[PDB]
């Protein structure tokens, strides 16, 4: 449970903390690998309930929440933690 912060695509953020943002602004179509998420440093990176830590995925592969929305948890120890969102 966070108050999510809504936030714009493309986005990116290199610090420490947690965050919990939220888009409606996801790609949703198989035919783009252009659209990713790719993040490293960090605790956590969950979004709609899947672990997405310290990876490269695409925005497809990740359906929206019932309510259409991507709601993202980031949490980083360290200064360097490093999340983008195409």
Known sequence: SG???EIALPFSYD????Y????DQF???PND???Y???WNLDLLEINGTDYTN?????????AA??????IHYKSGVSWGHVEIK
């Open 20 to 23: 919990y943002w939220k888009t």
């Open 3 to 5: 108050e999510y912060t």
């Open 33 to 35: 690998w252009s659209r």
């Open 55 to 63: 990876v490269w995925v695409a925005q497809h592969q990740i359906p």
């Open 66 to 71: 019932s309510d259409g929305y991507w709601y």
């Open 15 to 18: 610090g420490a903390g947690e």
């Open 27 to 29: 790609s949703t179509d």
């Open 37 to 39: 998420v790719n993040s």
